[PDB]
Amino acid sequence: SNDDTGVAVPGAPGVLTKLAKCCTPVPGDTIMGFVTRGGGVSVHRTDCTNAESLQQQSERIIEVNWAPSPSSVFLVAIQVEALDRHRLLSDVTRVLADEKVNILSASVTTSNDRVAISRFTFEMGDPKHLGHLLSVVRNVEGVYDVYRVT
C-alpha cells in the first residue's frame, strides 16, 4: 500500500494514500487528494465522476502532484467482441497467448445488438502503447467498436 503508490506528498513523508475506484487516476494526469474521513487520502482525478460531491466537501483536501514513476498501475479495460460459434470465441485465448490480463469488466450477452458482446478486460495502462494491443486483439474482422473503458 505505502510501498509503491503514494510517494508524492509535498508536505512531509509518510503516506496513507489509496487510489479509490473512481477513474483510475494512476496515469500522470491532473489529480488531487481528499483526506478520506476514516481511511486515508483518496486520490482522485480532475475528470472523475464523483468529483463534484467531493468538492462539496471543500475543506478536507490538500495539494498533490503525483509523479512517482517507479510504481504500479490501476489498469483499464476495452470493449471487444467474441462470436460464440466454434471460432472467434477462442480468438480471445489466441490473442491472450500474446498478453496476460486480469479481469476488469467482463460481460457475456448475445440476445443483443449484432454480436455476442464479450467486453474484454486488459492489462494495458500506457499512453503510447494502446493501438498495439488493440491491433493484436482485432482478429475477428468485424472490429467496429474499439474505445477503452473509463
Binding site: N2, G11, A12, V15, L16, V35, V41, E59, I62, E63
Partner: protein, 82 residues
Amino acid sequence: PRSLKKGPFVDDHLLKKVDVQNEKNTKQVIKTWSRRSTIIPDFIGHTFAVHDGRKHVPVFVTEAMVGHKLGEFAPTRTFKGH
C-alpha cells in the same frame, strides 16, 4: 483531566510547526509523530498525519474537535470481526 491551571498540552514541535503555517498562511500537511497534544483553536484547516505506530492517518481538523487529544483521530488497533 489536564487541570485548567496547567493549561492545554501541545508538544512544542507541532506548535512551532503550526504557528509558522499560520503566520505564512500555508496549510501543507504536518508530519508530526507525537499524537497526545490537545487540539487548540489555532489550526482548524491544517492536516496532521499523527499515528506512526503503523500508518499515515491524515486528519483534517475542524471546529468540532478542539480540545480533544489529537490521537483520538488515529485508531491504533484494528478490528473488523472474527
